[PDB]
Amino acid sequence: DMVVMDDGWFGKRNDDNSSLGDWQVNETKLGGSLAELITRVHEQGMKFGIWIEPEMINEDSDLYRAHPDWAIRIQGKKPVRSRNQLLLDFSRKEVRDCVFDQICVVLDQGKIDYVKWDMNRSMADVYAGNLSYDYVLGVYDFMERLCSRYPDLLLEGCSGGGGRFDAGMLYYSPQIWCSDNTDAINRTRIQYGTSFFYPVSAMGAHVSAVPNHQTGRVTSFHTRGVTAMAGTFGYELNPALLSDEEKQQIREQIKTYKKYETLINEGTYWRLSDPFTDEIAAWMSVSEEQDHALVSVVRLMAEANQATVYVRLRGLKPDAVYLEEQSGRQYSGAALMHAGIPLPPFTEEYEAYQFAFTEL
C-alpha cells in the first residue's frame, strides 16, 4: 500500500557522516522535487512515507557550521561522537523551532501519510542536572506539535530500532520499530519479550531479505512472513531481486495479514511457549468473543527422527467446538488447551505454521 523513503533523502546525506540538521530535500538525488516524487508514487497507486531524525546534528552540516553551540556539549570539552553525530539541545525552544519549521516545509510538500521518527545515539556530555528531563520535555513538545499539526499522520517511533520502545512514545505513535534486527529467529525472542507489556499492534515488524543483514542467517520466506505478522507487518527489501515464487508469497502474505489484521491487532494475545527454552516460538491471538483464533508457530530446533511436538492453545472456550480452517478438522476448546495439536513433521530448518480456528 505504501513506500517509505528512509534515511538518505536530505542535505547531502549519501552516508551517515553528514547532513543531520539540514532537512532540505536533496533534489539532485531525487531527480526533482519531493512534491513531484510523491505524485509519481501516487500515480503508481501508492501512499508515501518519510524518515526523519530531528533531535540530531552532524558536524558536517550547514546547521552545525552556523550553530555549533546548539549541540549538547560541555564548554571546553570535546564531545563523545556516536554514529559520527551529536544531539541537538532539545531543551532549547530556539533549537526545536528551527528544526520543526524545516520538517513542516518537507511535510507540506505533498500527501505524506506516514513519518518514521528515528533517533540514533545516546545522550552524553550532559552539562547540567536539569538537562535529561528538560530535553525529553522538548522532545514531547515537538512530538505533540507535530501530531496536532498533522492529525492524520501515522507516526512510527524509532530509535535504532527499539531504543525508546516505551509507553511514553506510544501515546504519540501507534507503532514503534521493534528492532533493527529483522532476523526472523531473533525476532521471535525480541517480540516475545516485547509482549510482556506491549501490544502486538505496537510492534513494527518487516519481512527482510536473506542472508539476513544483521546475522548472516538464512530463513525461509514463509517463516519471515509468519514472524513479521506478529506486529505491523510490512516489507524492507527490493522485491525486484526475488523469485516469482517469493513474489507470489508476498501477494498471499498480504492477503493473509489483511484477513487477520483485526484479530492480530485487537485480539487477546497469548504466549504459548518460551523461545529461550522450548522447541518452538508459538503465540496466538483470540477474538474478544473467543470465536476466532490465529495460532503461529516457528520451530527453533532440529534433530533427526523428530519427536512429535504439540502446540497447546490458550484462551478459548472449553466447551465450544472450533473448526481448523485448512484441515477442516473440529476440536473442542478443552482438547485444544489440554492436548493441543500435533505440528506437521518438519522437513527443513526453522519451519513455521499458522493455524486458524473458527467457533462452530
CB nearer to a copy of itself: pick between 25 and 210: 210
Q: Does 133 bind a copy of itself (CB under 8 A)?
A: no
Identify the sign of the CA torsion 70, 72, 76, 79: negative
Q: Does 160 bind a copy of itself (CB under 8 A)?
A: yes
CA distance 38 to 41: 5
CA distance 81 to 166: 25
CA distance 7 to 224: 24
Part in contact with a copy of itself (CB under 8 A); list of ranges 3-11, 24-32, 209-217, 229-237: 209-217
Name 140's Cβ contacts closer than 8 Å, sequence gap at least 6.
Answer: 168, 172
Which listed residue (156, 246, 279, 351) is catalytic? 246
- Number of Cα atoms under 13 Å in the Cβ half of residue 82: 12
166 is catalytic: yes
Q: Which of 1, 128, 196, 326 binds a copy of itself (CB under 8 A)?
A: 128
How many degrees, rounded to 5, is the angle at CA 228 between CA 224 and CA 233?
130
| Cell numbers representing residue 126 in the block | 550532559
Site string for a copy of itself, 18-57 (x = CB under 8 A): ----------------------------------------
CA torsion 304→331→199→182, rounded to 10°? 30
246 is catalytic: yes
Helix (H) or strand (E) holding 322: strand 321-324
Q: Which of 53, 89, 118, 183 binds a copy of itself (CB under 8 A)?
A: 183
Q: Which of 163, 225, 231, 275 binds a copy of itself (CB under 8 A)?
A: 163
Q: Does 218 bind a copy of itself (CB under 8 A)?
A: yes
Part in contact with a copy of itself (CB under 8 A); list of ranges 139-147, 222-230, 237-245, 328-336: 328-336
CA distance 209 to 219: 9
Q: Any idea which residues carry the catalytic annotation? A: 166, 246
**Which residue ranges make up the site for a copy of itself (CB under 8 A)?**
17, 74-84, 120-122, 124-129, 160, 163, 180-181, 183, 185-186, 211, 214-218, 302-310, 318-319, 329, 331-332, 334-335, 337-342, 345-349
